[PDB]
Amino acid sequence: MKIATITGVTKSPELQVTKAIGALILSSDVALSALTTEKISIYIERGNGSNVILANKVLLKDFILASTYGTENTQSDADNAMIALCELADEGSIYLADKESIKITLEDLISDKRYDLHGIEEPQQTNNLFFFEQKSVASEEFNKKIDVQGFDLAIMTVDDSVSDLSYQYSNGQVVKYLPFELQTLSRDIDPIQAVLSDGKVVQGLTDRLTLPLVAVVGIEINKSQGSIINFVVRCLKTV
Amino acid sequence: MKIATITGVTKSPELQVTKAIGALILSSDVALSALTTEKISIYIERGNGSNVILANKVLLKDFILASTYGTENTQSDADNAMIALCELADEGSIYLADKESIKITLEDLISDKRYDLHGIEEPQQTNNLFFFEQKSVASEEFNKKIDVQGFDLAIMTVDDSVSDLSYQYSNGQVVKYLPFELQTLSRDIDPIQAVLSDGKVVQGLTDRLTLPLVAVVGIEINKSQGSIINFVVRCLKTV
Amino acid sequence: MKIATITGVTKSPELQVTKAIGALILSSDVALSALTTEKISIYIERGNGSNVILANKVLLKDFILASTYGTENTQSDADNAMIALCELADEGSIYLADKESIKITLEDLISDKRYDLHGIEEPQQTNNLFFFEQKSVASEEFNKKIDVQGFDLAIMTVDDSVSDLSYQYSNGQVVKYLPFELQTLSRDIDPIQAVLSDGKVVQGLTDRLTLPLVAVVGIEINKSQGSIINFVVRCLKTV
Amino acid sequence: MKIATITGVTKSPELQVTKAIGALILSSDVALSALTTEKISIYIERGNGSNVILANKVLLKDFILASTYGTENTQSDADNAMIALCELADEGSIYLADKESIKITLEDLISDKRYDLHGIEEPQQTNNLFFFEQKSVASEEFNKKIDVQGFDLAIMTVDDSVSDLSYQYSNGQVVKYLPFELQTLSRDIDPIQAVLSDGKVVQGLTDRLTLPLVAVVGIEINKSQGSIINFVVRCLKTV
């Protein structure tokens, strides 16, 4: 069902959903490439316990790209320049116990734009949920190793100062990759990334890269100074 | 083989095919979005028993859309502005006895256009066939229940007077959607509906909506008064 | 890794690859429709006797079209006008026994265009390899039968003289197709052949057609005199 | 044997050595104290397997200082202003197996300068090799503790922010040193670090310090905010 419509304000109010949903539809008149600083934060609140945080100030571009990788792609309309569907659980929907609800907030919005939220319910309830985490490589340092065991998808910020990537697999084999090779490998699973309103397609953003991780237990990044690199990693687990 | 080429008239001659075909190819110089009133009628004239009716004046837009849902789409050559492949059977082709035939006819054409029919033969024979049925919702009706048990695909005429549509599943849950929600959810299965000659792609017609029915046993329509809603449903069965 | 950057010459030198690779990346500033006479030759050199010939002076267009059939398609970029990923083995990379290495070369290049090779490494090794063969039908004859058993993919040249293409399957059934029917049927599996730089798509090349051979043991060509018809077939086998 | 000469370019091509060498001779017309940002990278390559990295983008000053500590020192001549010999194995040459080779590259050079590489081989072969690693202390942190167990040498960045540095020995005792005390103890073992072309000698550099770690299992560095501090450590292990 329709959740909220935000316009004319920089910060969206705390939105509460008491109905068990399975996915969220984000629709806005801002094109996906034009999104700059919008952030989202979704979690599950319990009456007599600690909250369960699924996302925490995740960038809208990273959230959309992580949630729409595969056969699907973000679409458009005559009135909305961006429509995306992002699922919060595998197969079924989220099971809500007593005194349990869902809370969604939006931050860093543009004054003269529009945003909408829609909730998508399912005929089933499941215990598996999606979590989003962030890993940063600082600008001052040169190389860094980050452990991505248990994750199945990552989003890299694309920059020209990054030179080398290293993948360590489960069987201990280490493979060397370049940004060009990584982009070409990424575009062999989901060729088209988005469809524009006028009819043209875009096969990938110029500042984000979607890395599918299978049997990967580590990522080493070799770069130079002057820029900060960010990874948005997605995982599935039972709460 | 080439069945017919029709131009200059408003009604097709009663065409007959004796060879066992499994699929039809409809080609025309009229774009997919420019089809208005053309209709098709297909039926197999059996010799031992009753005849088989596969399509009874089905509108050409819905006939094309109900067959090209999934990995495929309707294409366009440099000469023909619309080419579509529509299957009449499952896997193999239609099994025909010594003197049986398949009779096809077209109605409500345009005198300054051209329509071309092709038939595809297949190595195997089968008895399973696809049936296209038509359902209607009256102008004075408020809410209506339709049993879609056994079907797997429907096409509805998009109208502004339709408020809600509710899916009833096999296990007994009822989920109420919206037109926008249904469009978004259906666009994630076949993100591309057609490809134009100039290279632009179209992700969906603005006046038809395709609904895939998986484990769905009921459809409830809630709308206002003053319009007739049209559904074209496809089913697979053995005759 | 980086293999070669050929620019300013009409013939690339012999290139040796010592470590195991499983895929090549061909990149250039000429689009898929701008490749005319470029040829590629890949083989495996054994130190003490005999070589394994995978591809010998195969046209670059046919090599690219025989590898990117299916979900994938040839990519573009803001700098590279064509990128194509062609796998040289199934699943893993090519296993190398004692004292052998891969060797690649190019012929018939345009002296004012840029070509680049990249290699892809994998964490697995395999024995299966992809072999490419070429078949021809002369210009002074009318009909001819060719035997394609064991090949899973073929590429034929498209000419106006081709009238009928008869298939012969493993159960003995014979089906006669037309060029239009073949073109329509081949686009039901891969509807998009390439994605252009500006955001448009192309569903196929004008002079080349791709035929997937499943349960097919023979082909017959009925054509008029005037043009030589060329086939490039791909097979998978162990070495 | 001679490997390569570099002049004009800021980056060296990936240099391959197939003959088993045991030491590298680096020659340049810029004095040892004049090196600013030149980097070196060396690794052993297996044709079908994983590479064995010995040094990955190590500063040339640190590479030279970590190998010429003791009785030896970097020398010079009328033509070459800096000649340094760096050993890559324990007491023989690298034993290359069936398909291994050696790859060396140089990065971030100066356009108007000259660099020369030479290789030294000897009748003995061995498996023990020298590995180079790098450790860092952030520019915002006060007190840091690092582990140096198993390493036999370190090159630290001399900065005026350093106040205290305490060793921890294998018997449990902790001794605190100042920069002046550390420099004096370092020059107590190796008094002369280089001999200039004209005839003067230099005892050590103004920004790098060499620490021999004998029976030391931990280091604690106590400083103030302002800058990053780099350690380059070296170890010997069997491949």
Author numbering:
A (entry chain D), B (entry chain E), C (entry chain F), D (entry chain H): 1 to 239
Relevant lines from the article:
In this study, we report a detailed characterization of ΦCjT23, an icosahedral temperate ssDNA phage with an inner lipid membrane, isolated earlier from a strain of Flavobacterium (previously Cytophaga). The virion structure determined by cryogenic electron microscopy reveals similarities to members of the viral kingdom Bamfordvirae that currently consists solely of dsDNA viruses with a major capsid protein composed of two upright β-sandwiches. The minimalistic structure of ΦCjT23 suggests that this phage serves as a model for the last common ancestor between ssDNA and dsDNA viruses in the Bamfordvirae. Both ΦCjT23 and the related phage FLiP infect Flavobacterium species found in several environments, suggesting that these types of viruses have a global distribution and a shared evolutionary origin.
To address distant evolutionary relationships, we determined the structure of the ΦCjT23 virion by cryo-EM. Single-particle analysis of complete particles resulted in an icosahedrally symmetric reconstruction with an average estimated resolution of 4.1 Å. The observed 200 MCP trimers, occupying four unique positions in the asymmetric unit, follow icosahedral capsid organization characterized by a pseudo-triangulation number T = 21. Within the asymmetric unit, type 1 trimers circle the five-fold symmetry axes at the vertices, type 2 trimers reside on both sides of the icosahedral two-fold axis of symmetry, type 3 trimers reside on the icosahedral three-fold axis of symmetry (contributing one MCP per asymmetric unit) and type 4 trimers reside between the rest. The asymmetric unit contains 10 independent MCP monomers, contributing a total of 20 β-sandwiches (V1 and V2). The penton domain of the spike presents one monomer per asymmetric unit and constitutes an additional building block. As these 21 building blocks are not identical in sequence (MCP V1, MCP V2, and penton domain of the spike protein), the triangulation is referred to as ‘pseudo’. The dimensions of the faceted capsid are characterized by a face-to-face distance of ~55 nm, an edge-to-edge distance of ~54 nm, and a vertex-to-vertex distance of ~63 nm. Inside, a lipid bilayer with a thickness of ~5 nm is discernible. Spike proteins extend from the 12 vertices, but the density corresponding to these was disordered in the icosahedrally averaged map due to the presence of a flexible hinge region in the spike.
